[PDB]
Design a protein around this ligand. Sequence first.
Ligand SMILES: [Zn+2]
Ligand SMILES: [Zn+2]
Ligand SMILES: [Zn+2]
Length: 482
Amino acid sequence: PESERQFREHVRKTRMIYDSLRMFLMMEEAKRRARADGKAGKAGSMMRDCMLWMNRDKRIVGSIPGVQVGDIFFFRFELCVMGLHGHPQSGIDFLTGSLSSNGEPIATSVIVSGGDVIMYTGQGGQDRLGRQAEHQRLEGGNLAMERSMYYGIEVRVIRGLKYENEVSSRVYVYDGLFRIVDSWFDVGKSGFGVFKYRLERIEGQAEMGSSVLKFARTLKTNPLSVRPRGYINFDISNGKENVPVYLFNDIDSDQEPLYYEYLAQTSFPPGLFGNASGCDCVNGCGSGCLCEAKNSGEIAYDYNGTLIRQKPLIHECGSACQCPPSCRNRVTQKGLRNRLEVFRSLETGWGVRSLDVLHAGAFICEYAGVALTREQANILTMNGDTLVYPARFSSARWEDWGDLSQVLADFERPSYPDIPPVDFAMDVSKMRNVACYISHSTDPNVIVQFVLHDHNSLMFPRVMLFAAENIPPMTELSLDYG
Ligand SMILES: [Zn+2]
Ligand SMILES: [Zn+2]
Ligand SMILES: [Zn+2]
């Protein structure tokens, strides 16, 4: 159905609001982490007060519309926002009301720690560190689990994993629906009674996200163990990036990406490249400096290097600035830092995916090619060559990024100045980086921002790519080429 698409869109907007709100609370406090979790919880409660949560009444059993298997989350409260799990410190979430059941409570969602069948231990009677301290009782969550076994209730499983990411200390991934097919009384070596439940996954679902996670990680540590064939080359960047760029092909013998000369940063025409002024933020850019004024009164990034909102042009600090490398206004000049993979595909010629988790608003890499003037572009274009026009990239799908107007009534969007559009062209037929293998899509998960750092010509800003949402590993990256 297309109502499915409508659900997915609603979820998209909800997540954009949540992450924007979090980031705002962080900017507010930092103007004056372990702060991450508290701010996440606050964002949650604020969204709750504004009636912005999904599945608020918990009356939904089984799939949450718009939330798909493999979706990743960074906080427990976030799961409450998306209606997946309503108890951020408890393993079992349950609904007292009755459909099947008879007003009898039934478990609708469980949180499972990482180490398909799951041997799940009931809750209750533990200390502050979760250590069993008394006999469990068949009440609340446990009784609800029992009842869900009895009534054959579809139970959502969300797996929690200590997983590398830049927003929190863990990753929560939705693994879909399981059924409880057995339950029993069991004893630990402590001697306390506990309840155990055997969970089995429902047949015919998409691959679990936790499997994809472990797979990606393994690709970072020992790729040949899971992919003994396919890897043509483990760095086509060929040491020109600070991280290796994988090249994978398990379909045929084509090795085209090898035949380009890798170019990590866009090459501007010789004889463009000095006079400009820098800020004096010797402890890093905060508020009220010159570079902020250059950015219409708002520094593009938060203190975690994350894009706050889209802008027509980003002025990063350069050599004229007295801020150190750790300054929050020096994001894209760091270059690629994520491990990416250019892989053969059928529907697209080649595609790009990330081995790492990518969070909403995070910088991925530059879109690097050979930049032309209008004369040079014209000459190559009269010969028949095809050129890329960065002005045609569309990020309009994610323009609500940073919008807090649904949470804060008094919110006004900071100015997005009307400037002349970029008009230069890029050739990527000879020299290019990983980003040039990114496929086209009307529903992109990557946005474009024009950035200046190394030079100060408005006519020739760099093309920098940012993750538009929380992208789990192995998800293909896409751009709207327009
Ligand atoms: Zn500054
Ligand atoms: Zn600075
Ligand atoms: Zn500066």
